[PDB]
């Protein structure tokens, strides 16, 4: 008469790592590193905006590509690889800082500057480089100011925008840089050009400079874009001679949102809190090996294919 104590075993067992052994066999184990991701931006439950080929900067200045994204509300903002910011070629100062501010916002309202110009000014410059409805056009939120009489000196002008709102406003403008002496003369006159801009928190001077350059979108001219934040109650003033690309509206960034740069198409029928370039990560696991670049609420990135956590005893086969 015997009675014997024992444990179970399984025919085929899993190998895991311990402190004292790299090849320990156990009855069972699960993964702790996530390896599979969704190939979709899972936007269900999110007021998301997919920008398409509109670059965030273009929403502020009103590049044609961004006509559907001039104002709106969102809690998630998606930027795409092919995104266009400039139709009229140029560049923006502190552009990455401006992009990040836009990509952290929860929306944009637009507000008129109310700028008006005397009769010696043509405030409606257009160009082939900015087609809007099959016709020559220009940045929606800016006005290209040139002399109404082709070779004459652009008049000394002053324009002031008053932020009468309770939140700060973001105002942008441009400085035209002609590609020839003749072009400068026809647009603004032979006079020396000077453009200065000021608020309680900003003071600066700009001078259009002629220079030969490669054509971009057909033009050898450029615009330098600048921006600043006009505080509540504060006044910003433009004093100018020709060359100013003037704001017709200003921007107000509202609330907060999650910015995402991605390749993946949107799925509005699935939910996620973690995003990367290739889509979404939905997992309960603490670690992931898909990408070191994620935004949102994510498992930590680790340099490991697999990390098995034992869920059973040592497997001791018969």
């Amino acid at each position: 008469d015997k009675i014997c104590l024992g444990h179970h075993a399984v025919a085929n067992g899993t190998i895991v790592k311990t402190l004292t052994n790299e090849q320990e066999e156990v009855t069972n184990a699960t993964e702790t590193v996530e390896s599979t991701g969704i190939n979709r931006l899972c936007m269900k439950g999110r007021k998301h905006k997919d920008l398409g080929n509109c670059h965030p900067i273009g929403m502020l200045i009103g590049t044609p590509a961004c006509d559907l994204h001039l104002t709106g509300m969102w809690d998630t903002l998606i930027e795409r690889e092919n995104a266009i910011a400039y139709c009229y070629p140029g560049a923006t100062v502190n552009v990455e800082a401006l992009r990040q501010k836009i990509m952290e916002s929860g929306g944009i309202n637009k507000i008129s500057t109310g700028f008006t110009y005397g009769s010696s000014i043509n405030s409606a410059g257009t160009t082939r480089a900015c087609m809007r409805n099959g016709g020559n056009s220009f940045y929606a939120e800016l006005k290209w100011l040139v002399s109404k009489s082709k070779g004459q000196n652009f008049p000394q002008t002053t324009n002031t925008y008053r932020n009468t709102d309770t939140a700060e406003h973001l105002i942008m403008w441009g400085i035209h840089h002609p590609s020839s002496t003749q072009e400068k003369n026809t647009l603004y006159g032979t006079q020396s050009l000077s453009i200065s801009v000021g608020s309680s928190t900003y003071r600066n001077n700009f001078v259009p400079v002629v220079g030969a350059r490669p054509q971009v979108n057909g033009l050898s001219s450029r615009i330098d874009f600048h921006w600043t934040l006009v505080q509540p109650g504060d006044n910003i003033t433009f004093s100018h001679n020709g060359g100013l690309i003037a704001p017709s509206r200003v921007s107000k960034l509202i609330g907060r949102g999650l910015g995402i740069q991605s390749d993946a198409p949107i799925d509005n029928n699935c939910e996620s809190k973690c995003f990367w370039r290739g889509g979404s990560i939905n997992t309960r696991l603490p670690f992931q090996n898909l990408s070191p670049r994620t935004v949102g609420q994510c498992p930590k990135y680790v340099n490991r294919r697999s990390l098995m956590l034992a869920t059973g005893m040592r497997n001791v086969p018969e």
Binding site: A9, E81, E96, P286, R314
Partner: protein, 171 residues
């Protein structure tokens, strides 16, 4: 480590698909097998306790500091690379240690639950049985199917069989 699993217990029983730990008996009317539910649930519960902690993580919201689609200034780019890689080295190391540590513990915990089952039966059998060193208890009295069961139940009263058992042990 506790000495039973991968220890004085030769191997596991692939045929016990009803629990993690159990009994095999041999008496007059044949042999039997039966899993012990308390000890296996102790072990399973402790495992699921670890799995809960593994998934009981909850998340800070991070935003992007690296452009996927445009050049970042070179010096701030290098700082961000150094920082991100340093963070990752820490996490890779935390994940490796976590799992190595947790697995060591899980294995020894299971060995411990085996040893505690073994020890309870021993004390239960008192002076009526002797250890064979490979996990069995040789019982020095007639132990019927309903006796065996009393051993698994914890019903078994040693004083009921003590006289008989001591007699056969000493002879």
């Amino acid at each position: 480590l506790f000495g039973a699993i991968a220890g004085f217990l030769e191997n596991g029983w692939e045929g016990m698909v009803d629990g993690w730990y159990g009994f095999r008996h041999q008496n007059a009317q044949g042999t039997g097998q039966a899993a012990d539910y308390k000890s296996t649930q102790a072990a399973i519960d402790q495992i699921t306790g670890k799995l809960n902690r593994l998934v009981e993580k909850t998340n800070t919201e991070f935003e992007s500091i690296e452009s996927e689609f445009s050049e970042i200034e070179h010096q701030i780019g290098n700082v961000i690379n150094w920082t991100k890689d340093s963070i990752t080295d820490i996490w890779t190391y935390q994940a490796e240690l976590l799992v190595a540590m947790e697995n060591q513990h899980t294995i020894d915990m299971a060995d411990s639950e085996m040893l505690n089952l073994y020890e309870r039966v021993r004390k239960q059998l008192r002076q009526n049985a002797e250890e064979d060193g490979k996990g069995c208890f040789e019982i020095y009295h007639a132990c019927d199917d309903s006796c065996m069961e009393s051993i698994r139940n914890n019903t078994y009263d040693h004083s009921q069989y003590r006289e008989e058992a001591l007699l056969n042990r000493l002879n």
